[PDB]
């Protein structure tokens, strides 16, 4: 349920390529989608010999999703994890070298609230970090600013900071805001999470 949502998110971006991500730095799933065909999923951890991963498949309706869930014992960080997807014909389908700590995909931020300032007139956004996620101080965010009719504005939020004060917004317009998260710690990395539940607000006039 939470895997499928994140998988579809990654599928939307680069549908052709092999997609790998981790959630708690204790797991890893690689998956690709095709138009069924047979493949072999192999991986090499650190300097350990090559192992084969039990490859699963299911229809998305009509495309098919091939995924492998790595054994928990082989989900170590800070070491090279070479991946190889080979077709049954012997032809090479994918070949990647990743680090598990560099493919983190957090949940979407929650509790997004938009409010006017007391006397200022400016809009202040406040949200909460992704639930059930440790090390909040090392998460940076990005807020999306949108207005009606015809139109987008992106603001980068520094790590640990869970609120944003917006200025230069057009008067008497309807703005809609959303915020996503990602790992920002130097020894870590990954991809932008899905956007949070959006919130709207009507600005006063200039």
């Amino acid at each position, epitope marked *: 349920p939470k895997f499928e949502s994140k998988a579809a998110l990654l599928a939307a971006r680069g549908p052709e390529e092999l997609l790998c991500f981790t959630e708690r*730095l*204790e797991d890893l799933v690689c998956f690709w989608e095709e138009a069924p065909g047979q493949y072999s999923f192999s991986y090499q*951890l*650190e*300097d350990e010999p090559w192992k084969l991963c039990r490859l699963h498949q299911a229809p998305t309706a009509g495309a098919v999703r091939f995924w492998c869930s790595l054994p928990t*014992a082989d989900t*170590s*960080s*800070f*070491v*090279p994890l070479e991946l190889r997807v080979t077709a049954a014909s012997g032809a090479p389908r994918y070949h990647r070298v990743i680090h598990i700590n560099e493919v983190v995909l957090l949940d979407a931020p929650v509790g997004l609230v938009a409010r006017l300032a007391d006397e200022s007139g400016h809009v202040v956004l406040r949200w909460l970090p992704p639930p059930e996620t*440790p*090390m909040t*101080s*090392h998460i940076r965010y990005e807020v999306d600013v949108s207005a009606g009719q015809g139109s987008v504005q992106r603001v980068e939020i520094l790590e640990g900071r869970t609120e944003c004060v917006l200025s230069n917004l057009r008067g008497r317009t309807r703005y809609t805001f959303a915020v996503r998260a990602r790992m920002a*710690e*130097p*020894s870590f990395g990954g991809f932008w999470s899905a956007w949070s539940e959006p919130v709207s607000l009507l600005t006063p006039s200039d």
Partner: antibody, heavy 119, light 111 residues
Framework: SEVQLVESGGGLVQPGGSLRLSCAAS????????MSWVRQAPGKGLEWVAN????????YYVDSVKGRFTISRDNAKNSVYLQMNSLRAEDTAVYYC???????????WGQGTLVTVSS | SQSALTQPASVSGSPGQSITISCTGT?????????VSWYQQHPGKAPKLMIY???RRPSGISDRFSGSKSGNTASLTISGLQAEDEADYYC??????????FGGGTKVTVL
């Protein structure tokens, strides 16, 4: 188990003096692993000093050596280096070279080179 | 300096008995990551990796050594204690400050 780490460059140095440690690695693909320096004062415990990214683009230091110590590496020569400037008396320790592996753990250790800072 | 993780100064046990060494930190290190490891050091020798990732063992390490953690405290257990187990034991953890932090160390004595 064929993996071997050999430190070099230690010795006696006056306080304020400089010193460059070297660590020759063999038995593994050196350019794809973090490398680390760990020191141990005589009779005392282990202290982490510095880590370095496989490509050397990121470096981290223990607080007391910042601005004084510099970690570096040469992947073509399979070596890790630790430039030690403005050496203090409390820097006196056996300096170990360690390979960073699974979960950041130090899988392989050198025998260490002794650094003594005194007058 | 950054305060080392809290380990007992020394633990002792008779041969065959089981002992456990504690390693207490905060939710910013030990309780915040799975990157916890244990090391064994005999006098005059380089440290040796016994446990990594809280509970995992290297290929040549005895199954008498086991690791675990609850809250902000990691634990190294040595079942079937032997004379060769007499050494210093250190824990290590990743911290929020992008550093790696050893514990004070525990001197194990076999009676």
């Amino acid at each position: 188990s064929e993996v071997q780490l050999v430190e070099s460059g230690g010795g006696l140095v006056q306080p304020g003096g400089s010193l460059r440690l070297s660590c020759a690695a063999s038995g593994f693909t050196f350019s794809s692993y973090w490398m680390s320096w760990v020191r141990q004062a005589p009779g005392k415990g282990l202290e982490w000093v510095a880590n370095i990214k496989p490509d050397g683009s990121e470096k981290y230091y223990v607080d007391s050596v910042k601005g004084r110590f510099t970690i570096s590496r040469d992947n073509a020569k399979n070596s890790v280096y630790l430039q030690m400037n403005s050496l203090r008396a409390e820097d006196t320790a056996v300096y170990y070279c360690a390979r960073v592996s699974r979960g950041g753990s130090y899988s392989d250790w050198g025998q260490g080179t002794l650094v003594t800072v005194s007058s | 300096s950054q305060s080392a993780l809290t380990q007992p100064a020394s633990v002792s046990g008779s041969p065959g008995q089981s002992i456990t060494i504690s390693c207490t930190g905060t939710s910013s290190d030990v309780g915040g990551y799975i990157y916890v490891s244990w090391y064994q050091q005999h006098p005059g020798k380089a440290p040796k990796l016994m446990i990594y990732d809280v509970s995992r063992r290297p290929s040549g390490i005895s199954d008498r050594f086991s690791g675990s953690k609850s809250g902000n405290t990691a634990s190294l257990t040595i079942s079937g204690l032997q004379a060769e187990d007499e050494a210093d034991y250190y824990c290590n953890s990743y911290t929020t400050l992008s550093t790696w932090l050893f514990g004070g160390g525990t001197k194990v004595t076999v009676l």
